């Protein structure tokens, strides 16, 4: 029984809440949007 | 008119301009143009912030511009954009060719003209010459008037400069000719009239930029300058050792230009530590960083790493903890380096 | 001023001189001080030639 | 055209090669006539629009969308949008051209309606190749 078991297993399982928008370009264009 | 928004950083001089522009946009969607003049590294930021208003969700009367972009638009209305553009490398190549046939006329740079790094050095020097309102005639004036060595190298530079301006005449456009062409086309630009123009993010201006600035003082209805300092004097230039010497000197420099045209001016001083209200340590810094009898932990941490690798691997853990426990986001964190080349490839 | 002071090694001072007066001799202003191995490989090559 | 040539707003090669017919043809049209007669007019209006992430991306914060509206004019009826296209044409091409610039026009209308808080009643696109106009 180790004191950091819960902490470590919480952290290794953690995923960033807004990960799906970290790669999304802020500025876009009309031509680019249509292309999407 | 003219306005002066002054105050030490941490005081929402930057947010005040935004909320002002946002409100002027709320009152009138199709009013007279609101021009935001920031450095090229600040354009995207302001474009992203000005559009973050839930009720409007964007801008149309207000445009965020750099000097170059403003020059491009104004010249797209007045004229001059049809003239071919040259890159710094193209200018270097022109200087190479010019050196090859004027090498025997030099007084000092006759042996150094064999090197390829030299043409880059000349390129940078001539660039600075255009950026500070100096035509070949002025360089010749300096040459005619280690003064010996300086006069001789200015003589060589004179030759290269003159021949460059002679070769680019009635055919090409230099990279540093946009702002000069801008300053002399603003008067005959109708869209400029009655438009608010806001300056923020600049620490100083080149004389070439100063020409455009004062021209905007003339032909624009209103203009506000946001400078980061602390009660700067309009009578004398700041001391060399004091903190705000750049912004202070520009603050001084603008006043003579404003009082010369005799335009009514407005004051603005910001006292509040708006940014550092939540945490104690940050506020003290802004006010008494400069202070020599420095008066004497949660937010301010001084870290020592074994190397740059351990430094970055440590900063990674801190950022991770900040978004994991402290509920921060990655968009909140900033990482600054005086010499980015020492960390980039490892970052 | 102490940050700009001339407290260097002799080699560093010589470098400063080179960077300042590159034009007096046949030298490029953007010269690079080569690795010991790099220069020795150049020396080896010109020796063979 | 000559003044734009002397102002260096037009390249000499751009000035030499130009059709003169369609320039006349547009101002003889209905939308052109409504353009000449209007309360207020503006052209080349740069805009930045904030769109929620979901409206472009399937899963799950505004992203910016910028552009330049060719023309806007206001009459006693409402606000009308105008855009010029040099598309190749010369009836059957109209349904294709409608969808080719559909999302674009919708983005322009969304920009005006959201930012200016007004509303756009009808859009119009003019084509130089023939002098055709279609409405959206």
Swiss-Prot record, chain A:
Q: Transmembrane region positions?
A: none
Taxonomically, the superkingdom here is Bacteria
Additional comments on file? Answer: This enzyme is a functional homolog of the E.coli RecBCD enzyme; unlike the RecBCD enzyme it degrades both duplex strands symmetrically.
Spell out the subunit comment: Heterodimer of AddA and AddB.
Q: Which family does it belong to?
A: Belongs to the helicase family. AddA subfamily.
- Say what the protein does: An essential component of the DNA double-stranded break repair machinery, the heterodimer acts both as a highly processive, ATP-dependent DNA helicase and an ATP-dependent, dual-direction single-stranded exonuclease. Recognizes the B.subtilis Chi site (5'-AGCGG-3') which transforms the enzyme from a helicase which degrades both DNA strands to one with only 5' -> 3' exonuclease activity. This generates a double-stranded DNA with a protruding 3'-terminated single-stranded tail suitable for the initiation of homologous recombination (Chi fragment).
Instruction: Spell out the protein name for this chain.
Output: ATP-dependent helicase/nuclease subunit A
Organism annotation: Bacillus subtilis (strain 168)
Name of the gene: addA
- Complete-protein stretch covered: 987 to 1022 of 1232
Swiss-Prot record, chain B:
Q: Where does ATP bind?
A: 9-10, 13-15, 228, 275
Q: What is the effect of changing residue 205 to A?
A: Wild-type Chi fragment generation
Taxonomic superkingdom = Bacteria
Cite the UvrD-like helicase ATP-binding domain residue spans from the record.
1-270
**What's the impact of mutating residue 41 to A?**
No longer recognizes the Chi sequence nor generates the Chi fragment
Q: What's the further remark here?
A: This enzyme is a functional homolog of the RecBCD enzyme; unlike the RecBCD enzyme it degrades both duplex strands symmetrically.
Q: What does the protein in this record do?
A: The heterodimer acts both as a highly processive, ATP-dependent DNA helicase and as an ATP-dependent single-stranded exonuclease, acting in both directions. Recognizes the B.subtilis Chi site (5'-AGCGG-3') which transforms the enzyme from a helicase which degrades both DNA strands to one with only 5' to 3' exonuclease activity. This generates a double-stranded DNA with a protruding 3'-terminated single-stranded tail suitable for the initiation of homologous recombination (Chi fragment).
Q: Which family does it belong to?
A: Belongs to the helicase family. AddB/RexB type 1 subfamily.
Q: How does it assemble?
A: Heterodimer of AddA and AddB.
Q: What is this protein called?
A: ATP-dependent helicase/deoxyribonuclease subunit B
* Span covered, complete protein: 2 to 359 of 1166
């Amino acid at each position: 029984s180790f004191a950091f078991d819960e902490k470590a297993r919480e952290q290794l399982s953690w995923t960033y809440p807004h990960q799906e928008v970290t790669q999304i370009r802020t500025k876009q264009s009309v031509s680019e949007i249509k292309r999407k | 008119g003219a306005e002066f928004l002054v105050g030490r950083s941490g005081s929402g001089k930057t947010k005040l301009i935004i909320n002002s522009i946002q409100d002027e946009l709320r009152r009138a969607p199709f009013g007279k143009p609101i021009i935001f003049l920031v450095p090229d590294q600040m354009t995207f930021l302001m474009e992203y912030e000005l559009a973050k208003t839930p009720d409007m969700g964007g801008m149309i009367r207000a445009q965020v511009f750099s000097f170059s972009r403003l020059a491009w638009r104004v010249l797209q209305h007045t004229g001059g954009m049809s003239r071919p553009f040259l890159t710094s490398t193209g200018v270097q190549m022109l200087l190479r060719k010019l050196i090859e046939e004027h090498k025997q006329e030099f007084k000092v740079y006759q042996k150094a003209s064999d090197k390829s790094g030299f043409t880059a050095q000349v390129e940078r020097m001539l660039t600075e010459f255009k950026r500070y309102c100096l035509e070949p005639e002025d360089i010749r004036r300096m040459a005619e008037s280690g003064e010996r060595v300086l006069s001789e190298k200015l003589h060589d530079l004179s030759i290269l400069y003159q021949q460059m301006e002679k070769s680019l005449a009635d055919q090409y456009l230099h990279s540093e000719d946009y702002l000069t062409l801008l300053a002399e086309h603003i008067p005959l630009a109708e869209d400029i009239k009655g438009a608010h123009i806001y300056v923020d993010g600049f620490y100083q201006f080149t004389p070439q930029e100063f020409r455009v600035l004062e021209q905007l003082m003339v032909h624009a209805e209103h203009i506000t300058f946001s400078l980061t300092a602390d009660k700067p004097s309009y009578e004398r230039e700041p001391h060399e050792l004091e903190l705000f010497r750049m912004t202070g000197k520009t603050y001084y420099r603008l006043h003579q230009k404003a009082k010369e045209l005799n335009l009514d001016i407005t004051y603005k001083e910001l006292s509040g530590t708006e940014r550092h209200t939540k945490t104690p340590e940050l506020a003290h810094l802004e006010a008494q960083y400069e202070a020599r009898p420095a008066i004497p932990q949660e937010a301010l941490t001084v870290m020592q790493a074994a190397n740059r690798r351990a430094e970055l691997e440590g900063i990674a853990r801190e950022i991770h903890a900040l978004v994991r426990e402290k509920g921060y986001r990655y968009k909140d964190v900033a990482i600054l380096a005086r010499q980015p080349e020492d960390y980039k490839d490892m970052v | 001023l102490l940050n700009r002071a001339s407290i260097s090694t002799l080699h560093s001072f010589c470098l400063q001189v080179l960077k300042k007066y590159y034009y007096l001799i046949d030298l490029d202003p953007g010269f690079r001080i080569a690795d010991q191995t790099e220069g020795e490989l150049i020396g080896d090559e010109v020796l063979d030639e | 055209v000559h003044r734009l040539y002397e102002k260096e707003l037009l390249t000499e090669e751009q000035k030499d090669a130009i059709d003169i017919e369609e320039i006349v043809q547009f101002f003889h049209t209905e939308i052109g006539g409504q353009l000449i007669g209007a309360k207020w007019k503006d052209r080349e209006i740069p805009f930045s629009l904030a769109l929620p992430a979901k409206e472009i991306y399937p899963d799950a914060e505004p992203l910016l969308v910028q552009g330049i509206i060719d023309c806007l004019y206001e009459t006693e009826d409402g606000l009308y949008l105008l855009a010029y296209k040099s598309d190749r044409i010369e009836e059957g091409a109209a349904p294709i051209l409608k969808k080719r610039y559909e999302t674009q026009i919708q983005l322009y209308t969304k920009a005006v309606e959201q930012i200016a808080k007004t509303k756009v009643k009808g859009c119009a696109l003019y084509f130089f190749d023939g002098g055709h106009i279609l409405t959206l």
